[PDB]
Amino acid sequence: HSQITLRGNAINTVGELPAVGSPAPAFTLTGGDLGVISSDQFRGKSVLLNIFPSVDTPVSATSVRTFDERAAASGATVLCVSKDLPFAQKRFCGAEGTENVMPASAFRDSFGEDYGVTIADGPMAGLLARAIVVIGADGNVAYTELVPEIAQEPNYEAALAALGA
Amino acid sequence: HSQITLRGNAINTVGELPAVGSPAPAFTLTGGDLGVISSDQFRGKSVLLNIFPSVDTPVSATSVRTFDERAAASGATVLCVSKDLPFAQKRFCGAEGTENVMPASAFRDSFGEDYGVTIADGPMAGLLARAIVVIGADGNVAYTELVPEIAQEPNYEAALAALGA
């Protein structure tokens, strides 16, 4: 089980991110329209998981906008994964015009425990930590970042080099 | 998993239809000549999946005739998907002169499980529930309908509006 900071104060996740080279855990998430978004849908393609506390937080929202702009440019598949309700993700994407990213919600699924990423303690317990996971066409993890501090933006450049690779 | 009615009576499907905006589950199906239809062959254009119990049931047969009539005018791609053996679909289309739809059998493929439309229980266990999926040119799901009651026809207009790019 891992460790990050929220405003310089130490907090814990419930596990660890999947190891590079190993099989990315299977997932079934909830789409904006309450449909499913299964890992099986991305098999044989690369996908980046942009994992964060909430679209309704500022660094998280910025990451959605930045990945939407950058994906737009390249046809990259980016999944924006959080504990938001589907309705919040959808409302955000619709308010902002952010239409390359696919929002997906972990509100009724095991994603957060499975990816080691649920915050275990402090003010944000139950949300997902800020992390990036690149899953290759192969289904195995190509690259990961656990952002050290929650108020820090993800490393977009390293995540997307991994993804294009 | 999802739930529908058959003549008012609650029935379950094996899973859930994919969220609009997410990658359409890949498939292979069997065409009237016992060849392979693959989801790949449609990439670049919108395709509408008209999914139903059987050509040899009336509402289902009506949906095929109605999509044929409409797709013939616009030249839209409509695939008629069921657990019927290929020979029934082919016979139906030939008896009825419905030459604009493409029939496709899941009788030896995982379509129904993958799209979550296979009925779990009752008299109709193992048949595909009545549903529409429109896959855009990009291969993402553009539109879904799980018809609430099996005895009811699908919403042609809303499906066809999504199919028109």
UniProtKB/Swiss-Prot annotation, chains A, B:
Superkingdom: Bacteria
InterPro entries: Redoxin, Thioredoxin-like_sf, Thioredoxin_domain, TPX, Tpx_CS, Tpx_Peroxidase_subfamily
Keywords: Antioxidant, Disulfide bond, Oxidoreductase, Peroxidase, Redox-active center
Active site: S60
Keyword hit for Oxidoreductase: yes
EC primary class: oxidoreductase
Enzymatic reactions: a hydroperoxide + [thioredoxin]-dithiol = an alcohol + [thioredoxin]-disulfide + H2O
Domain Thioredoxin: start-end pairs: 18-165
Function: Thiol-specific peroxidase that catalyzes the reduction of hydrogen peroxide and organic hydroperoxides to water and alcohols, respectively. Plays a role in cell protection against oxidative stress by detoxifying peroxides.
Protein name: Thiol peroxidase
Natural source organism: Mycobacterium tuberculosis (strain CDC 1551 / Oshkosh)
